[PDB]
Design a binder for this molecule. Structure first.
Ligand code: NA
Length: 134
């Protein structure tokens, strides 16, 4: 179906403060996190994906098989651990992160030449949109 491989630059980042607050991130980290505009670097081969969130502060790496639950170490974000599953929902990717926080997960898809990422926790929705540099 869809190949997310690319270096994706952030265009839109809505409600990130609210999202981090819901994860109990301290204000000092939130202050700096919001000015950050992390890139997304994705390499995919079939059901195998590495998704790197790249910033000047901290990087976050997700390295998984679609459909295979794994222990996700959210070191650098809220430093929690989740039981995480990323699933194919047609061409969309749906991630559920089971753990402390209810309703934690995200949805990722491509519309035209933009990558959309919706991250959720406890009913907060953060909306991100990315584009490659042509
Ligand atoms: Na790996």
């Amino acid at each position: 179906p869809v190949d997310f491989t690319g270096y994706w630059k952030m265009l839109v980042n809505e409600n990130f403060e609210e999202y981090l607050r819901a994860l109990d991130v301290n204000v000092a980290l939130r202050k700096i996190a919001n000015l950050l505009k992390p890139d997304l670097e994705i390499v995919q081969d079939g059901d195998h994906m590495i998704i790197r969130t790249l910033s000047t502060f901290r990087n976050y790496i997700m390295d998984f098989q679609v459909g295979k639950e794994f222990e996700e170490d959210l070191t650098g974000i809220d430093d929690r651990k989740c039981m995480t599953t990323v699933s194919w929902d047609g061409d969309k990717l749906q991630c559920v992160q089971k753990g402390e926080k209810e309703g934690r997960g995200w949805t990722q898809w491509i519309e035209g030449d933009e990558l959309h990422l919706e991250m959720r926790v406890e009913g907060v929705v953060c909306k991100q949109v990315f584009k490659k540099v042509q």
